């Protein structure tokens, strides 16, 4: 595996270069929001993001060394987590707002148009406020997002190789913090704070998923990703 021989710098550069683009929404600002329309915008946007996420995963160090069945499993398990942390990252410079797209900026009030979505909106906003408070860096973000991909589905069925790559991303994070002038205690503390947020991202994905496959015009790919959680 070429991943297990990458230095911390090459790990960052590989992840940064593998970053998917920021897609635009259809969204016509001349028409007010309805429950069906806004759900259509988010669904259409997520579906196109999924395509980029799939090709992004292939460029994540160590992911290509895995079997196809395992690659499918990891993505089916963490696709909404990856979408959400991406959203939260894009919204970091926009307090009280969620930047789904450069042309789609929403507050929690606009989230009320869909019944039961404002609960998830507040959690996403709180996560964005946390990143903004911690002053999350892009180098740290791409590390966390890659961790989600490799970790979220690793305990639901090799694994020794995955944990080895996970350990490398951990070394990468520590290397970044040490470069930022953080003391040894500060490095371990910040590392803990970042990884604890992944627990909340997992929560938001589960609560989000639960609403999405409930009594909800989704694409065939998005349907299959949703039906993976039944």
């Amino acid at each position: 595996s070429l991943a297990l021989s990458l230095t911390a710098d090459q790990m960052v550069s590989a992840l940064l270069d593998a970053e998917p683009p920021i897609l635009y929404s259809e969204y016509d600002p001349t028409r007010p929001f309805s429950e069906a329309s806004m759900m259509g915008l988010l669904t259409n946007l997520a579906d196109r993001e999924l395509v980029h996420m799939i090709n992004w995963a292939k460029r994540v160090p160590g992911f290509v060394d895995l079997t196809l069945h395992d690659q499918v499993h990891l993505l089916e398990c963490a696709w909404l987590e990856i979408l959400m942390i991406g959203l939260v990252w894009r919204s970091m410079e926009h307090p009280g707002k969620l930047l789904f797209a450069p042309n789609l900026l929403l507050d929690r009030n606009q989230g009320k148009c869909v019944e039961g979505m404002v609960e998830i909106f507040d959690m996403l906003l709180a996560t964005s406020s946390r990143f903004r408070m911690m002053n999350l860096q892009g180098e740290e973000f791409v590390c966390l997002k890659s961790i989600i991909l490799l970790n979220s589905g690793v305990y639901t069925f090799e694994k020794d190789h995955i944990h080895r790559v996970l350990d490398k991303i951990t070394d990468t994070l520590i290397h970044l913090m040490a470069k930022a002038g953080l003391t040894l205690q500060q490095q371990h503390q910040r590392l803990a704070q970042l990884l604890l947020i992944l627990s909340h991202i997992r929560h938001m994905s589960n609560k989000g998923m639960e609403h999405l496959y409930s009594m909800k015009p989704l694409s065939d790919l998005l349907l299959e990703m949703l039906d993976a959680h039944r």
């Binding site: 090709n55 790919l221 990703m225």
Partner: peptide, 9 residues
């Protein structure tokens, strides 16, 4: 499975 196919590409 679409995901499995897109991964094959």
């Amino acid at each position: 499975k679409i995901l499995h196919r897109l991964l094959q590409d």
